[PDB]
C-alpha cells in the first residue's frame, strides 16, 4: 500500500505503420522518472480494442501483468508471451496504490495494428 514514489511513463511501443502481419509480439517501454521502483505494483493490461478512436476505450484484456522487466537503470519493458492474432491493440498501465490524485489513474500506449496476411 506504500507508494515508493516511482513515476512510470510509456515512452515507446511497437510501431505498426504499414502492414505488420500477425503474429508479431507487441511491447511497450516505460521510463521511471520518480524514485527507484521497488515494491509499488504498476499493473498492465494488453487490450484487444474495438477501434483506435481516442481516447482509447477498454476492450478485451488478452494478457496482463505488472511492470518488472528492467532494461536500464530507470527503464522497463512489458511485452506479449501469447501468440498474437490480427486486430487493434493497446497497453493500459495503472497507477499504483498511493499514487497522487492529479490526472488519470492509468495511461494508454498508442494503438498497434496487426494485419491478417493469410
Numbering used by the authors: 72 to 189
According to the publication:
Bacillus subtilis expresses TasA (translocation-dependent antimicrobial spore component) as the major biofilm protein, which aided by TapA (TasA anchoring/assembly protein, YqxM) can convert into stable oligomeric structures to form the biofilm matrix. In summary, TapA consists of an Ig domain in its core and flexible N and C termini. TapA thus functions as a chaperone in analogy to the chaperone-usher pathway since it already has a complete and especially stable V-set Ig fold and has the ability to complement TasA in the process of filament formation by donating its previously unstructured N-terminal strand. Owing to the stability of the TapA Ig domain, it is not able to open a cleft to receive a donor strand, and thus can only be located at the beginning of a filament, acting as filament inducer.
The longer construct was investigated because NMR showed long-range contacts between W74 and the core of the Ig domain. TapA71-190 shows a V-set Ig fold (InterPro code: IPR013106) composed of two antiparallel β-sheets. D71 forms four hydrogen bonds involving residues G169, W74, and R73. W74 and D71 together stabilize the loop between β-strands 8 and 9. The additional hydrogen bonding suggests a higher stability of TapA71-190, which is supported by the TSA data (Tm = 60 °C for TapA71-190 and 46 °C for TapA75-190). Structural integrity is supported by a disulfide bond linking C92 and C188. Intriguingly, the secondary structure pattern of the Ig domain resembles in its core (gray background) that of the TasA filament structure and the proteins of the chaperone-usher pathway. The high melting point of TapA (64 °C), together with the fact that it already consists of a complete Ig fold, explains its inability to be located within a filament.
